[PDB]
Amino acid sequence: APPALWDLAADKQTLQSEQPLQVARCTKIINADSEDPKYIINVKQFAKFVVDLSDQVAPTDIEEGMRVGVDRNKYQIHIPLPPCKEQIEKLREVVETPLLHPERFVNLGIEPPKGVLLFGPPGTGKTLCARAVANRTDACFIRVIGSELVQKYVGEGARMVRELFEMARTKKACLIFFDEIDAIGGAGDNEVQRTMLELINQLDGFDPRGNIKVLMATNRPDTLDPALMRPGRLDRKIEFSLPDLEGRTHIFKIHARSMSVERDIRFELLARLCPNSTGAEIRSVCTEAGMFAIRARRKIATEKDFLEAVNKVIKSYAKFS
Amino acid sequence: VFRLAKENAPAIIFIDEIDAIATKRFDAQTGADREVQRILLELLNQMDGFDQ
Amino acid sequence: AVDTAEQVYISSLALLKMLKHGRAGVPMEVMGLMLGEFVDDYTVRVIDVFAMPQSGTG
Amino acid sequence: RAVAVVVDPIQSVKGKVVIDAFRLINANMMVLGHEPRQTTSNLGHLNKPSIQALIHGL
Amino acid sequence: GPPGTGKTLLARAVASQLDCNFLKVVSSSIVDGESARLIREMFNYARDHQPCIIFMDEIDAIGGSADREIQRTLMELLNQMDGFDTLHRVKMIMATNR
Amino acid sequence: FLEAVDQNTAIVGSTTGSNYYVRILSTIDRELLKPNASVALHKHSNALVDVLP
Amino acid sequence: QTKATFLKLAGPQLVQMFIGDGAKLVRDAFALAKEKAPSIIFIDELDAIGTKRFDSEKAGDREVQRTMLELLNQLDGFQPNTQVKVIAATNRVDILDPALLRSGRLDRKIEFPMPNEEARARIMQIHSRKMNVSPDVNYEELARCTDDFNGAQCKAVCVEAGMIALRRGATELTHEDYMEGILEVQ
Amino acid sequence: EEERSKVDDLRGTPMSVGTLEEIIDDNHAIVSTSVGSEHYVSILSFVDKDLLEPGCSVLLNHKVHAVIGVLMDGLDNQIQEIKESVELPLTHPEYYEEMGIKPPKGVILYGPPGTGKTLLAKAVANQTSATFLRVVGSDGPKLVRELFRVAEEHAPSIVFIDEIDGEREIQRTMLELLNQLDGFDSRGDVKVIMATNRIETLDPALIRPGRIDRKIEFPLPDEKTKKRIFQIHTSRMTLADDVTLDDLIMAKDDLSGADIKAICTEAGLMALRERRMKVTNEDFKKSKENVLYKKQEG
Amino acid sequence: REELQLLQEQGSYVGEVVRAMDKKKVLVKVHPEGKFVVDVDKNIDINDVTPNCRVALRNDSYTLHKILPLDKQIKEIKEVIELPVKHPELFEALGIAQPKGVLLYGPPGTGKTLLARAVAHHTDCTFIRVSGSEARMVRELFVMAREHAPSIIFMDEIDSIGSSRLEGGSGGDSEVQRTMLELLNQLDGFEATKNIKVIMATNRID
């Protein structure tokens, strides 16, 4: 009641402010425009209404499929509303280098590259993406998985991909990341077919832009249609497989910004002590090392202490997987 | 139906598919079946009174 | 700041014209006018009453 | 004065053609009393719109 | 029509001449066992409008449990054509290849 | 018609499924108080003049 | 080169989960063709969707068959057919309908007898004339190295040649980059 | 008083019950109803607008819908690690706030005996002072989303999921559950403890994405915590010195809280035969034989 | 003719109040696009109106008006049915498990219903049935059982020779079987009062 007191005292001029803004047609959404004077609008009650644009709203401020406040009396719109070694380099030069020197690729060539392709076993995958986010010079991009594409009550995925591509247009060609193409792939399955064909249509389609990005990462490359469709636009396909022996020391060096590690500890030793280890796996290993370093009540961690945690954490996870 | 049957003539009443309709039920949401089986019991008492 | 008791005089003319206006009372918004002469403040008399052509504006 | 008359025969039964004329109160009279009109004996005749919603609602 | 084509041109000539009405029957109304009521509906319309002329082009496709349903559809056609109807008015034309 | 909760007054269901509460006229006898029957009200007054089988 | 509006319609696009879509699609397309300007309409893969399936056992799509029959019917018995044309193309000659012969229907028939090299080099030159390339080309190597390749594949050879030219450090495309791209993507 | 009683027009006869969707910084909110009508009107008094928790039912009108207000309606090394996991934002903070880690990805608990014995054993330890939520068992995961958001409101607490186990729907709703638990669009909210029986039945997608911290295999039956539980249940009861807990807790296999409560109840009941307030070992075993034979007979 | 204007009122809806509030403002459950919460008329008190009941509500002023509406068998069954009598006094010392119920297998030849009623008549106790008619709601019978300690529960309708689907009807009967299952689970779980038994009958493989 006390916070509502001063507001109740401020409710006096609300009576004189009641005359405008009071009209609500419950925000009917538009569809398209055949001609500028007359627009076709479809209310949520599935009743199509037509009204001319007012002088209070510019025609250039109207977007396709946009919700705006509309009068229920004059029917017009008074105001709108806002609501590795070589391979890692090859995949780095398709992201960082172009952004670092955009004009360089314009002068030295006809056009910058597109993207790369990731298939086979997951390996160290999805770690390099977060690494790329960490190496971002300005602002991190927005990643979109493949699980959001397939949902109940189909047909929402189209509006979703179109609105996120619209946000990409608002972001003036922001980096776009895709994941799990096998979920929407594998060409009752027609509902998936429409989504993946629309996806390929929006990809190969230069309408939003052709300079944005192409990235595909999947465990099983059993999809025939994206494979035959990709060479027309997408390019630069390389082998991923697993992490190499001397390749883990790079992840170690980029993880060297963590809690202080004794110089007596060899990186190559810990790298060769756990074969078939993903970047996130050895990251979890370093997590165990740091954790047991905290539990040891010391200021440092020695390899002799947590090596048991290492062989244990790798073997125990190797048992079921 | 019964009263027009007794009013008109010795008519012959036939009933088909008793297995599905006369099956007992428990839940109240499905209790309509209990209601119509109570109707069945009602006409059962009535036909018990129709024995003579 | 003075107010008296006013009473509106209605004849058969305006009544019947409002009956024809009742037949003209279709959902389409309509306009009408009333005429008369004011003898004083607290009495009002209406005599001439006609209709108006319909419009899309309402 | 500006006499305001609204006729709506659509939902009006043919049993009664009785109509109610309308008036406009001033916005500066909100401080003082609402209607300073004499001859209160005719309010019972003005009680014909006995509907329990629109009258004391509006 | 085994020696060539052009019968459809003659049918088009008659159709453009008089034809008494405008009607066309597709070769296969099946893919459109739920097409039986559709056929009976079309024939119901044929009974609704007394004057009728039927034009069927390329009927050799439908003339040929996979075969069982085909035979069933044929039996339905027999039942419908040999049923009770007045054929003295309605006319049917069939076009084919071999 | 639905049911009669008291004397000379009852409730009546509409076509939309919404039940309406309307007091019957004194002229109408108790014959129209039958639990299940076809009743016709006015489009405005919503009063029942007569019922049909 | 037609300078008009172009449309894209494929074979599987005519095949859907619903039924009786053919008539609606044809009538609507002809409606848009009636209302709009004399644009260009091109459909592809009419052979796969026009298969009459000699084998009598089973198959999923009989629809585009009668859709094509109705299309021919409207391309025959209708005077408006003098309006905007519809271009059709077939990949394989295994399936052909004898009823497709007419003025309104398919008329022009052109078989491709192993298209030559120098011509492909010419159109490739026309496509690549915009990009910056050192004006010395023998054309012999690039004409000889191309065997059973599409036009899109030649454009892909040009694009591939432009791909590594960016990381070579050279601001101008060379001759060997073409054949290098050929041996790269193909 | 007059200004307080002059609002009776909005809360009067023209009044309805609507459902608000979200609160906008533009001061004109959005409501909804059976037909989903939206009305944007400037705000008034009597509303909290903060703790209101939008997405619930509100008060509407036959009028312009100006809102006059709202209406509410050997595991020691393992157990110490999970102690420093879930009890991390709790008592004895000084081993945390010095540096800090805070990996709120949750953990996974399982073992060969299963039957939620060790799971409930570890779960009941956190029930001292807290808000506990037990979920047993596994259209879409709508109810799972409801539990997720209600746990988002219950975030300052501990959430414990127990008994985690057509067929293709289970996989995709498992992927959906994994995506929702991953916290894609949301930061750290509430600790989620995954508890199951066999880890071999679970897919590898429930290990790496789900928990980034630690997972420990179950080395033995852990008679210790069980001895503690039995001590808690027998704390109000009485016992002699000739009664050994070791062989008793070693003999029992796959029992729940209601089960041990039942066998203790029948232990006291069978100790009531001789009218003794003390329960012996032989009487405890003889009483246990009843339930032991009861469930194994059927 | 004074009511004629109330006929011009275009009738009135049927109000239902599921809940009452201490703010003296009554909420009413109505057909969709309903739920109009408003204080009632001044001449009628609020506390008189009971929740979860239908009332009369006008469609304009939204005001409430008024509330709207065999020797071998009995020899063996004696030690069973007459067991709850005077025994629980010494059952504190004995601590024996009380019998949950008794069932017989065979044809419905004679005295199926009359037997239990006769024994209950000789026991001078009330006879409580279920008879579901116009959630789970099986606790109410246990509440009534708590109210009246002596009781005899025998099921007539459970003995069935006549008509079933045996497919969905088997599950339909499995619902009742689950009901008596959880009932027996409650009886085995604890006891609010004595003299609680269940007697079923089956003429078939069930």
Which segments of A171-222 does DSSP mark as H helices, in order? Answer: 190-204
Distance in angstroms (rounded) separating the CA atoms of residues G84 and G30: 9
Which candidate from A108, A113, A232 shows the least CB-CB separation from G171? Answer: A108
Contacting partners of chain G (3+ CB pairs under 8 A) = A, E
How far is it, in rounded angstroms, from Cα G168 to Cα G149?
Answer: 26
Task: Break chain D down into helix, strand, coil percent, rounded to 5.
Answer: 10, 5, 80
How far is residue H97 from each of residues A298, H92, H158, H181, measured CA to CA in Å? 16, 10, 20, 26
Query: CA–CA distance from A10 to each of A7, E69, H26 (Å)?
Result: 5, 79, 18
The shortest CB-CB distance from I60 to any of D11, D15, D52 is to D52
Where do the DSSP E strands lie in chain E? 53-56, 91-94
Length of chain E: 98
Handedness of CA G102, G105, G108, G111 (dihedral sign): negative
Q: Which of F9, F21, F12, F7 has its CA nearest to residue F51?
A: F12
How far apart CA G24 and CA G18 sit, in angstroms, is 12
Q: What φ, ψ does residue I20 adopt, rounded to 5°?
A: -110, 150
B·I CB contacts under 8 A: 39
* A192 contacts A150 by C-beta, under 8 angstroms: yes
Burial environment of residue G57 by CB neighbours within 10 A (0 to 12, 13 to 18, 19 or more): exposed
Instruction: State how far the Cα of I182 lies from the Cα of G148, in Å rounded to an integer.
Output: 77
| Position G74, amino acid | Q
The DSSP output letter for E28 is -
Measured between alpha carbons, how far is residue H19 from residues A89, H72, I16 in Å? 55, 12, 20
Phi, psi of I87 (to 5 degrees): -70, -45
Distance, CA of I129 to CA of I126 (rounded, Å): 10
User: In the numeric block, which tokens belong to residue G122?
Assistant: 């010419």
Contact in structure between C56 and C30 (CB atoms under 8 Å): no
Q: DSSP letter for F33, please.
A: G
Contact I169 B18 (CB under 8 A): no
> Which contiguous run of DSSP H or E holds residue F21?
strand F19-22
Structure token digits, residue I165: 């689907």
Q: How many residues does chain D have?
A: 58
At CB < 8 A and 24+ separation, what contacts does G160-167 make?
G160/A235, G160/G184, G160/G185, G162/A109, G162/A110, G162/A111, G162/G131, G163/A113, G163/A235, G163/A236, G165/A109, G165/A110, G166/A105, G166/A108, G166/A109, G166/A112, G166/A113, G167/A93
Strand partners, F9: F6
Q: Is D10 on the interface with C (CB under 8 A)?
A: yes
Any idea what the Cα angle at residue B35 is, between residues B32 and B41, rounded to 5°? Answer: 145
User: Which 3 state secondary structure label does DSSP give A316?
Assistant: helix
Q: What are phi and psi of G19, to 5 degrees?
A: -125, 155
Q: How far is I163 from B19, CA to CA, in rounded Å?
A: 5
Contacts of residue I206, defined as CB under 8 A and 6 or more positions apart, other chains included, come to I173
Q: Which residues of A touch H200 (CB under 8 A)?
A: 320
Q: Residue G119: what are its φ and ψ, rounded to 5°?
A: -65, -45
Sign, CA dihedral A167-A168-A172-A176, equals positive
- What distance in Å separates the CA atoms of residue B10 and residue B5, rounded to the nearest whole number? 7
Task: Kindly report the nearest CA distance between residue D57 and chain C, in angstroms.
Answer: 24
| Beta carbons within 10 angstroms of residue H163's beta carbon | 16
Q: Is F45 on the interface with D (CB under 8 A)?
A: yes
The verdict on H145 touching A (C-beta cutoff 8 Å) is no
Residue ranges for the known binding site of E are: 1-8
Measure Cα distances from A256 to A92, A251, A294, D33, F50 in Å.
Answer: 21, 8, 17, 83, 94
Which residues 6+ apart lie within 8 Å of A315 measured at CB?
A: none
Q: Which residues contact I50 (CB under 8 A, 6 or more apart)?
A: I67
Q: What is the 3-state secondary structure (H, E, C) of chain I?
A: CCCHHHHCCCCEEEEEECCCCCCCCECCECCCCCCCCECCCCCCCCCCCCCCEEEEEECCCCCEEEECCCHHHHHHHHHHHCCCCCCCCCHHHHCCCCCCEEEEECCCCCCHHHHHHHHHHHCCCCECCCCCCCCCCCHHHHHHHHHCCCCECECCCCCCCCCCCCCCHHHHHHHHHHHHHHHHHHHHHCCCCCCCCEEEEECCCC
Pairing between β-strand H158-162 and β-strand H30-32 as defined by DSSP bridges: unpaired
F19: DSSP letter: E
CB half-sphere exposure, H101, CA atoms < 13 A: 26
Q: What is the 3-state secondary structure of A251-315?
A: HHHHCCCCCCECCCCCHHHHHHCCCCCCHHHHHHHHHHHHHHHHHCCCCCECHHHHHHHHHHHHH
- Closest Cα of chain I to B22: distance in Å? 6
First to last CA, chain F: 13
Name, in order, each residue with C-beta under 8 angstroms of E4's C-beta and a sequence gap of 6 or more. none
Q: What is the DSSP string of chain H?
A: -HHHHTTTTTSSSS-EEEEEEE--TTSB-EEE-TT------B--SS--SSTT-SSSEEEE-SSS-----------HHHHHHHHHHHSTTSSSGGGTTTS----TT-EEE--SS-TTHHHHHHHGGG-SSS-EEEEE----SHHHHHHHHHHHHS-SSEEEEE----HHHHHHHHHHHHHHHTTSSS----EEEEE-S-SSSS-GGGTTTT-SS-B----S--HHHHHHHHHHHTSSS-B-TT--HHHHHHH--S--HHHHHHHHHHHHHHHTTTT-SSB-HHHHHHHHHHHHHHHH--
Please report which helix (H) or strand (E) contains residue A162, including its range: helix A156-170
Contact between chains at E31 and G62 (C-beta distance less than 8 A) = yes
Burial status of residue I25 (CB atoms within 10 A of its CB: 0-12, 13-18, 19 or more): middle
Distance of CA H256 to the CA centre of its chain: 17
Identify whether the C-beta of residue H55 lies closer than 8 Å to the C-beta of residue A265. Answer: no
Task: State the helix-helix crossing angle for I71-81 and I112-122, rounded to 10 degrees.
Answer: 50
Measured CA to CA, the distance from residue E7 to residue E14 in angstroms comes to 11
Alpha carbon distance I172, B26 (integer Å): 7
At I16, give phi and psi (nearest 5°): -135, 120
HEC secondary structure over B20-50 = HHCCCCCCCCCCHHHHHHHHHHHHHHHHHCC
C-alpha triplet H282, H286, H288: angle, nearest 5°: 115
Tell me whether residue E52 is exposed, middle or buried, using C-beta atoms within 10 angstroms of its C-beta: 0 to 12, 13 to 18, 19 or more.
Answer: middle
Structure method: cryo-EM
Instruction: Give the H/E segment covering residue G23.
Output: helix G21-35
- Residue D35, φ and ψ in degrees, nearest 5: -115, 105
CB–CB contact B31 I133 (8 Å): yes
d(CA C38, CA C46): 9
Chains I and F touch (3+ CB pairs under 8 A): yes
User: Which has the closest alpha carbon to A239: A97, A96, A130, A84?
Assistant: A84
In the structure encoding, which two tokens stand for residue A172, read together?
A: 């003036």
Contacts of H218 (CB under 8 A, 6+ apart): H75, H110, H111, H112, H113, H118
Rg, Å, chain A Cα set: 28
Instruction: Answer whether C23's CB lies under 8 Å from C58's CB.
Output: no
Contact G152 A105 (CB under 8 A): no
